[PDB]
Amino acid sequence: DSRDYSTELSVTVAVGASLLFLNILAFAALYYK
Amino acid sequence: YHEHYMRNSRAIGVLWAIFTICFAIINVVVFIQPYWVGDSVSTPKPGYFGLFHYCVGSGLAGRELTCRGSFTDFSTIPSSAFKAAAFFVLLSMVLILGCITCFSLFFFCNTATVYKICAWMQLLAALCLVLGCMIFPDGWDAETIRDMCGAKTGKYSLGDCSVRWAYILAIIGILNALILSFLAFVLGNRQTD
Amino acid sequence: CLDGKDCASFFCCFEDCHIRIAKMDSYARIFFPTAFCLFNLVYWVSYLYLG
Numbered sequence: 001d002s003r004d005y006s007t008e009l010s011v012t013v014a015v016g017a018s019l020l021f022l023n024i025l026a027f028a029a030l031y032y033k
Numbered sequence: 034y035h036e037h038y039m040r041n042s043r044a045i046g047v048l049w050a051i052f053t054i055c056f057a058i059i060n061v062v063v064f065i066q067p068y069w070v071g072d073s074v075s076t077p078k079p080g081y082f083g084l085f086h087y088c089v090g091s092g093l094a095g096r097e098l099t100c101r102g103s104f105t106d107f108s109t110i111p112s113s114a115f116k117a118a119a120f121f122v123l124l125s126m127v128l129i130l131g132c133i134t135c136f137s138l139f140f141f142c143n144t145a146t147v148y149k150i151c152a153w154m155q156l157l158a159a160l161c162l163v164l165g166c167m168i169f170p171d172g173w174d175a176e177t178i179r180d181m182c183g184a185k186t187g188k189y190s191l192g193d194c195s196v197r198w199a200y201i202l203a204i205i206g207i208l209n210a211l212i213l214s215f216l217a218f219v220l221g222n223r224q225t226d
Numbered sequence: 227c228l229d230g231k232d233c234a235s236f237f238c239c240f241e242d243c244h245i246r247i248a249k250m251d252s253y254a255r256i257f258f259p260t261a262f263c264l265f266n267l268v269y270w271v272s273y274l275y276l277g
């Protein structure tokens with residue numbers, strides 16, 4: 001097995017950033033009076 | 034204007050709850066899966082290890098992963114730092130699952146009070162995940178982890194091993210937990226308006 | 227309180243909250259089954275699928 005962790009890291013960072021972005025969109029919704 | 038306000042609050046509360054369930058799933062996954070740190074090309078032996086469970090290869094140009102460790106059996110955990118980190122991540126799990134339960138309190142309890150209570154547990158959940166992720170590297174100097182990664186490996190030093198998807202997922206869990214907490218606190222102070 | 231309320235006013239419920247103890251049975255009637263179902267879900271999933 002090719003012992004490379006690049007695609008896994010990329011998809012993990014992608015899903016983490018997406019969840020973070022949805023949360024920040026929620027804050028934008030609230031602090032937008 | 035007021036009906037728009039109520040619709041926005043209700044919808045964003047639903048979204049919060051969905052993201053809270055997602056973070057609970059994330060916490061369960063990072064606690065269970067043993068993919069916090071793992072081998073590299075320069076490592077003497079292959080494998081991976083999480084908070085308590087660790088798998089290591091025999092070293093004969095094949096997989097042959099022997100696996101040992103279990104939170105139910107603290108003797109098998111390599112280090113006291115590993116034990117403490119596992120305990121803290123559990124506590125975070127308990128708190129987030131307790132929040133999901135409290136959702137049930139929305140029927141009777143004051144919405145504002147529930148948001149706030151769920152919010153504080155989500156903050157502590159974040160605090161305990163922070164403590165766990167800070168304490169877990171402390172145990173890297175254990176004999177088993179050194180035999181896995183190399184002589185360079187030590188307290189707060191990767192050496193030759195590399196962090197795998199569960200560790201960064203736990204960091205993302207910390208961020209999501211602190212963030213979720215706030216959205217709740219403000220969700221609460223707002224509901225009163 | 228980025229809003230500007232009091233920190234306690236924005237963080238804790240040191241206003242009304244205890245008083246609402248008569249409804250504690252009403253709370254428990256749905257709290258305890260939810261907690262047990264959640265524990266069973268995580269327990270069975272963890273011991274069957276994830277490990």
Ligand SMILES: CCCCCCCC/C=C\CCCCCCCC(=O)O[C@H](COC(=O)CCCCCCCCCCCCCCC)COP(=O)(O)OC[C@@H](O)CO
Nearest residue numbers: 103104105106107108109110123124127130131261262265
């Ligand atoms: C007891 C039944 C009735 C009351 C139940 C009340 C609830 C209590 C909770 C859990 C059990 C209590 C803790 C018991 C722990 C087990 C007993 C214990 O403490 O002994 C030590 C730890 O053992 C071990 O590996 C055990 C290590 C892990 C113990 C904890 C496991 C996870 C518990 C997660 C709970 C979440 C609850 C959530 C509620 C919503 C070992 O010593 P010993 O000299 O043998 O070592 C030498 C070695 O060579 C033995 O192989």
Ligand SMILES: CCCCCCCC/C=C\CCCCCCCC(=O)O[C@H](COC(=O)CCCCCCCCCCCCCCC)COP(=O)(O)OC[C@@H](O)CO
Nearest residue numbers: 043046047050051054133136137139140141142143144260
């Ligand atoms: C696998 C994971 C499984 C997890 C399952 C979790 C489920 C756990 C059990 C029950 C949840 C109970 C939710 C009940 C929500 C009902 C909320 C409701 O009654 O409506 C109003 C809005 O409340 C609110 O904005 C509160 C919003 C509730 C948000 C929490 C519920 C989320 C359910 C979405 C599920 C998604 C699943 C998807 C997973 C992939 C408040 O009423 P009300 O003005 O009259 O009161 C005023 C006062 O004077 C007397 O109550």
Ligand SMILES: CCCCCCCCCCCC(=O)OC[C@H](COP(=O)([O-])O)OC(=O)CCCCCCCCCCC
Nearest residue numbers: 137140141248249250251252253254255256257258259260
């Ligand atoms: C097996 C269930 C049999 C009973 C059917 C479900 C009961 C639904 C009744 C409607 C809710 C209601 O107003 O009455 C019960 C209480 C409030 O009681 P009261 O003191 O206001 O009269 O209000 C509540 O506490 C909400 C009801 C929560 C029911 C929880 C169901 C889970 C049951 C777990 C066992 C399988």
Ligand SMILES: CC(C)CCC[C@@H](C)[C@H]1CC[C@H]2[C@@H]3CC=C4C[C@@H](O)CC[C@]4(C)[C@H]3CC[C@]12C
Nearest residue numbers: 103104105127130131134261264265268269272
């Ligand atoms: C009461 C509600 C709110 C929370 C319940 C928390 C439950 C889900 C927690 C408490 C203790 C936890 C267990 C503790 C230890 C282990 C051993 C590990 O190798 C697999 C996960 C497993 C089996 C955990 C699964 C989840 C668990 C059962």
Ligand SMILES: CCCCCCCCCCCCCCCC(=O)O
Nearest residue numbers: 259260262263264265266267270274
């Ligand atoms: C009476 C409703 C209780 C609500 C909680 C439901 C889950 C209870 C636990 C049932 C466990 C029974 C053993 C199942 C074993 C299996 O997976 O086949």
Ligand SMILES: CCCCCCCCCC
Nearest residue numbers: 057058061264267268271
């Ligand atoms: C897909 C793997 C899901 C693991 C269990 C999730 C439990 C979430 C909190 C109830």
Ligand SMILES: [Cl-]
Nearest residue numbers: 102103104105
């Ligand atoms: Cl285990």
